Each structure stands twice: as C-alpha cells, then as structure tokens.
Amino acid sequence: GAMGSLDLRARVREELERLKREGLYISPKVLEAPQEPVTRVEGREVVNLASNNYLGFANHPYLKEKARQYLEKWGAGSGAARTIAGTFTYHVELEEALARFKGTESALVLQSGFTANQGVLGALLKEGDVVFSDELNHASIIDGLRLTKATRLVFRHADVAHLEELLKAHDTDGLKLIVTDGVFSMDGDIAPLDKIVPLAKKYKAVVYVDDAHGSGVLGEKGKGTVHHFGFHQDPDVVQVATLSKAWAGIGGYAAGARELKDLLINKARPFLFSTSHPPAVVGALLGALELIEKEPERVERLWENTRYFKRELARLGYDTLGSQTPITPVLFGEAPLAFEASRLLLEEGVFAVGIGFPTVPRGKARIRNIVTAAHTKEMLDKALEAYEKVGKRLGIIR
Amino acid sequence: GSLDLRARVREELERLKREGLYISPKVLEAPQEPVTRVEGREVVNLASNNYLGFANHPYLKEKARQYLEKWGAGSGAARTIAGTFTYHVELEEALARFKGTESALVLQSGFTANQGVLGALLKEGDVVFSDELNHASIIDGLRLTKATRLVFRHADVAHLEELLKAHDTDGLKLIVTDGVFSMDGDIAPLDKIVPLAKKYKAVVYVDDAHGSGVLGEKGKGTVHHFGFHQDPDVVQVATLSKAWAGIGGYAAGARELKDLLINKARPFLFSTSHPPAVVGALLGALELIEKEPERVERLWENTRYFKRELARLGYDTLGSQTPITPVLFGEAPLAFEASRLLLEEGVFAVGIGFPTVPRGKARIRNIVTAAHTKEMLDKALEAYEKVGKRLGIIR
Ligand SMILES: Cc1ncc(COP(=O)(O)O)c([C@@H]2N[C@H](C(=O)O)C(C)(C)S2)c1O
Ligand SMILES: Cc1ncc(COP(=O)(O)O)c([C@@H]2N[C@H](C(=O)O)C(C)(C)S2)c1O
C-alpha cells in the first residue's frame, strides 16, 4: 500500500503481536546446571521432568570420556559434508555400531532427527507414490513429505480401520508408504505396528517409522519399537530414529540394507548439503551404545520409574491420556491452565513445561513429564507432592 | 502390484549409475587439516571448508574439552523446552558482538537455518526474488513457504530491478542471495542490491556460509564487508561449520528477528539444541580469531598466490573472488579424470560437473585455507601442471 512493502521490524512486530494475542508467544527457560534429573532454573534446584534424557546419559562420565578421547584425537570439526571429504573413520565406526545394535545390515547418520525425516522421505518418494500418514505425526515428518511430489493421505490417529479404507481406495504402481511416529511425542502412545505391518503386506505397502522416542526405551535393551514388535529384519520396514534423546547427543539415523544406505548417501538432501558431525559428538554416541550394553538394567529402571509415576498420578485424580511410555502427559485442558500449573510447579521446585494448541488440540493442553532412569523415588515423590498441591489449588483434583 | 522398498532403491541406484551421477564418498583417515590421509595415502587437502585452520586447532579443542567436562555430552532437549543452557546464551552474545548485529541465534545447521529463517519471515502474498544460483538449502526453505517465488539471473541487478518494479506487494519483498556462491567463489553484489532494495522497499537476505570468517574486517562476513551489518532490513544466515570449524548455523540481525525465530522457526522449535563440546569449540573459535587476526590475512595471501600461479600455468579460475578457487576443465568427464589424476599425485580436491554446475563449466573446486603452507600449495600447483599438460588443458 501507500507506505510500500513491509520492513523487517514491521513484519516481526505484526507476527509477535499476533502470537501474543493467540497465547502462543514463548519465553523458554535457561538451565544453569547440566542436563540431569535435578538441575537449576532461575537460581534454584529443581526436579527436572522436561528433558528427553531417558537413560541418564546426557551428563554421564562414560560418554564424556569417550567424547573427550575422540575430541583430542580428531579435533573440533569435520570441515565438510559427508559426500565430499567430511566422512572420517569415526563416522563409519558409529554407523557400524548402530547397525549392530539395531540388528540391521547397515545404518546411516544424518544431522538430526528433524533432517533425517526430510532426507529419508525425500530419497524414497517420487511423483505418483501414495503416502498414508498418521494424523498426529511429528512436524519433521510433515515438512519431509511437503518437499516430495507424493500424494499424501492422512489416517485418523492409530485407526487401522481408517488406514485400510484408504489403502483400498488409493492405489499406485509406484511406492505406497505408511508413515508413523513409533512413539508419539506428545501423548506417549505406541504406533500399533502389530496391526499396521500385516495390513501393509496385504496391500503391498512399505512402513516407515520415526522412532525418536522409542530408541533406548522400547525393545530389548532399548533397540526400539520396530525391534519390540519383531520387525527389525523386514526390508519393507524403514527405521528412522534420533540420537538426541536416550542416546543424549545430536543426530538422526536410518537403519537397513546396504542398498538403502547407498540410496540415502546419493539422494538425501540434508546429507548431500550439510556438514558431518564432529568427533566429540560421535565419540559420545559410541560411548552411549557401549554403556547401554554394560548397564542394560537402566531400561528396566526407566520402566519401573514410569509405572510408579503414572500410577501415583492416577491415584491423585489426574489423567495421563493413555500414555504408554515414560512420556507422561498430565491433562489440564485449556492452555492457560497448563501454563499456570507449570508456573506453580516451578514454585514448588518441579520443572515441567506446559504445552497447548497448536502443538496439541484445543482442550487437551497438558504438562509433558518425561520420566528417566536417573530419577530417584524421592525426586518422583517430590514431583507427585507438587502435583497434588498445585492440582488441589487449581481445583482439578480433590 | 506396487514397488517394494528394495525395488524402489534398486530403480533409483540403477538410474543414478546409468546417468554417471552415483557417488562413492571417500573415508578420511586422519584429522581435518591441510594435509590428511585418504585411501591409505597422505594428500594435500583442498577439499575442506576449514578456512582458518581451526578444525584441529588445540585452542578450540581445549575450550571444547572444558565445556564437555563441565556440562556433559548432550543438551537433552529443544531450545524451547529444556535445551537452552547458559553456554548457548554465552555463544549467542559472543556471536552478536563479533558480527556487529543487535542479535544472533544459533540453529542446528546452515542448511536448517535457511529453512527456519525463510519459513519464519515469509507468508502467503509475499514475493521472493532469488538469485539463479542460490544454494539448495535456500531452495528447500522457500519450497516450504507460501510466498511467490521469482528468480533473477545470477548477479543481474538489471533483471532484479525489472522484477522488483513489476511485482509489488503489501506484505514482504525478500531478495535472497548467497553471500559467496559455493561453486564459483564470486561475491553477491550487495553494494548494488541493498540500494535497490531501499528503492523498492525490500528486505535483503544473505546466506553467508562461505563469507563468514572470510570476508570483511577480521572475517565478520560479507554483509560487514559491504557496510550493512547495522541495517535492520538486512538478514544474515550462515554456518558455523566452515571457518568456525564446528557444526551449526546462525541468524544475525535486528533484535526483533531473534524473537521471531525463537517463536516460529521450525528447525528451532522441533529439534534438539547443540551440545557443550560444540558450543565450547565455537566460543574458542571466536576468541582465537580475535587473538590471531593474521589468520584471515594469511588465508587471503595464500588465495592470491594460488590463483596467480594457476593463471600463470594457463588455467581459468572463473573470476572467483574468494579462497574458493575453481579450476575449469570444461566437461564433466574431464573434470572427474583430472580429480582422479590429481589424487594419484597426492592432491585431494573435488570434481564438479553438471547438474551441479553448467555444461561446459565442469571444474575442480579447491578451497585454500590459512593453514596451507607454501610447500603444500606448490605441491598442488606441481600436480595441476602435470595433470593439465597430460590432459591438454594447458601448454
Ligand atoms: C551457501 C551454503 N549455505 C549452507 C551450506 C550448508 O551449511 P551446513 O548445513 O553444513 O552448516 C552450504 C554447504 N556448503 C557445502 C560446500 O560448499 O562444500 C555444500 C556441500 C555445497 S553444502 C553452503 O554452501
Ligand atoms: C517423533 C520425533 N521425531 C523427530 C524429532 C526431532 O529429533 P531431533 O531433530 O531433536 O534429533 C522429535 C523431537 N521431539 C522433541 C520432543 O519431543 O521434545 C520435539 C521438541 C517435539 S522435536 C520427535 O519427537
């Protein structure tokens, strides 16, 4: 109009004002001690139920020592993309260790779980393919699909009846790909692969699982959701997951046939066009895989802690939304009440972050608690005491 | 019937092999340095982006070690939830100070920074004006937006003006360019683009992956070089993985930009923050370049030397202006053969042909660094002379 196209500060102001009006403006907390089940926020020690540190690895000396070894040997940076002089021996060492752990012929690491989805989906899919995506799939899956030319269908969450209706109605001569989170990040439920994968065979579809929140959590020694349901050697199951949660570093990976690995090396755009991970990162992750083999009882402790916390929340009167994994949402309903409960929990010494629309539905705002192997009973009971006090105060529990 | 996974993979791998585009990367067997080891042999490495010699520098490694020991192996969360720690803020403050901008935000890569910042800025009804030769990660970031996308001929400010005149909007006009073009090593003409932006009420976005640590006073970057680092209508994105010899990307500009990105950039909202060893190395890098500003000088000395010697042999370096030093071979097969023959001489550089670069403009890309010595550069020049004579590109 009269004054011309917007300047940057005007565009920013208009978007920030809009977000503040919609109750979406965020001011994240700064942690002042390491990533542990007790940490420091705003000058205070707090029970931390906000992180993805499922196994207690993020500040574990074993990982730190292997990191240090690789840092000293190889340096601070790789200096290139994997394709052109950024692959070093340590990259391949980690890929081989991951494949062995996962039980697949091969494994390929990408720069994040977020980019792994983009890269793997983009390498696999082509115009005229059909994708069947779970309604509640992660945002990184959505962005990966949007960069492809595949036809995209959405099935109601975990609804295998709906999925079969779409598989009957929508055919192709190319690839049919059923795409799901393995463990859904917000509600903590598990994709029903026991039903999806047989369905896939009946309609000659491939299944793709983003197991970010199942790696190090489900299956024998944390080998993941796909391993848990017994499908880890099926070549028509594509396994993606992340190295940033249980494994407590950064990165994403795919695991399968030497030839799938070769496709990703040739085609995945975040692999072709982004720098490889540095030695300290890779050494920590090699450490993580060694430590879970040494201390597999961490996974048992994780699940013991989980069942305890969930049972005690239910006894107070809270709703954990049918969650099945250490992801333990507590329903508050409206986003303002979730955010107020998070504030009041912090006053009590408990750090857990409120989440509302658009991340989760209107009227299904929650606080996401993630239980870890490193939480103690007294930490969990402190968190439960805080939830009792706050919930009574807000009138959601008796 | 449908395709199964192995069939789709085989179809696509066979396709790439029939097109001669299937790649088999090499595995480096020693640290990222100007001399390294490939396939069991020592080589002069002209295939890194390690402009300042920081990748294996003990100063970065010691600061990395300190932060690893203090804070651990992982952040364990996205920045928005429980993944912002004191050391992230320390790095952002240090980066803003070095850049000369009001603010700085670190993101998981230069690749994802482009997606995050373009996504946060752009809305339906905005008009983008992109340089023909912009990086692939800019393309992917634009594809995720609902903005109208126009392409101007490479560095053609006449063309850009014609488009800016013809395509007005009540929303945002964003002129998007690499700062330093990854393949040819030329520099965006921001001294003409930015005035043109003012005339047509546009914002300028610069992906300065290959300018950060390279151009400008003390390596402050391309936007600093052209004098526009305090302009709120210039947005900079770059990588921390080349000169700064880590991983990560950053966005630098007006204070309000940072606030928008925190709230809106999808790779920021939906991915884990970087770990202490990575942040510590980068804090180290910013301290080291303030202590040893002569590294930037050496980088440019080395570049001028290499370029002049290649010209003296009879090679064409394509008008490159930065340490990115392409040598023209013409067709892709000859560039690949030259790269193979250079490796046999102990010189490691990257052959590039169509589709990445135009037909007839296939090249070997060499990146000179501050850490290359005269004897290394002369070894490279010796190999180029031998190979060039053998292939008849030079006399
Ligand atoms: C202009 C530009 N922007 C972003 C990146 C990615 O930064 P990162 O994600 O690694 O932080 C690159 C990379 N440069 C590589 C190279 O020049 O060798 C490439 C293999 C072409 S991709 C780039 O040139
Ligand atoms: C299913 C799924 N896939 C990929 C990623 C991205 O992995 P990264 O890029 O960090 O390696 C996530 C992240 N989970 C975060 C969290 O649940 O806390 C998120 C903040 C919702 S994004 C995820 O849930």
Residue numbers in the entry:
A (entry chain A): -1 to 396
B (entry chain B): 2 to 396
Publication passage describing the model:
The α-oxoamine synthases (AOSs) are pyridoxal 5’-phosphate (PLP)-dependent enzymes that catalyse the irreversible, decarboxylative, Claisen-like condensation of an amino acid with an acyl-CoA thioester, to generate α-aminoketones. The thermophilic PLP-dependent biocatalyst ThAOS catalyses an irreversible, Claisen-like, C-C bond-forming reaction that yields useful aminoketone building blocks. In this work, we show for the first time that an AOS biocatalyst (ThAOS) can be rationally engineered to use an expanded range of natural and unnatural amino acid substrates. This was achieved by targeting a residue, valine 79 (V79), that is close to the ThAOS PLP binding site, but not thought to be involved directly in the catalytic mechanism. Structural studies of AOSs have shown this residue is part of a ~13 amino acid flexible loop that appears to control amino acid substrate binding.
Furthermore, we determined the crystal structure of the ThAOS V79A variant in complex with a PLP:l-penicillamine (L-Pen) external aldimine with a view to understand the impact of engineering at V79. We subsequently used the l-Pen ligand in structural studies and when ThAOS V79A crystals were soaked with l-Pen, prior to flash cooling and data collection, clear ligand density was observed in each active site. Incubation of l-Pen (1 mM) to the wild type and both ThAOS V79A and V79G variants rapidly decolourised both enzymes and led to the formation of a broad peak between 310–380 nm, with an absorbance maximum at 330 nm. This data is consistent with the formation of a covalent ThAOS PLP:l-Pen ring-closed thiazolidine adduct and this was refined to an excellent fit and geometry. The five-membered ring of the inhibitory thiazolidine intermediate is clearly resolved, and sits in the position of an amino acid substrate sidechain. The two chains of the ThAOS V79A variant align with around 0.4 Å RMSD Cα to the wild type ThAOS structure over the 397 residues. There is no significant structural change in the active site in the V79A variant with PLP: l-Pen bound when compared to the wild type PLP-bound ThAOS, with no shift in the loop around the altered residue. The distance between A79 and the thiazolidine methyl group and is 4 Å and modelling the distance to the native V79 gives a distance of 3 Å to the thiazolidone. It appears that the removal of the valine side chain increases the volume of the ligand binding site without any large-scale remodelling of this region. Removal of V79 opens this region up by around 1 Å, to allow larger hydrophobic substrates to be accommodated. The crystal structure of the ThAOS V79A variant with a PLP: l-Pen inhibitor bound displayed little change compared to the wild-type enzyme so this suggest that the enhanced properties must be due to subtle and dynamic changes to the structure and electronics of the PLP-bound transition states.
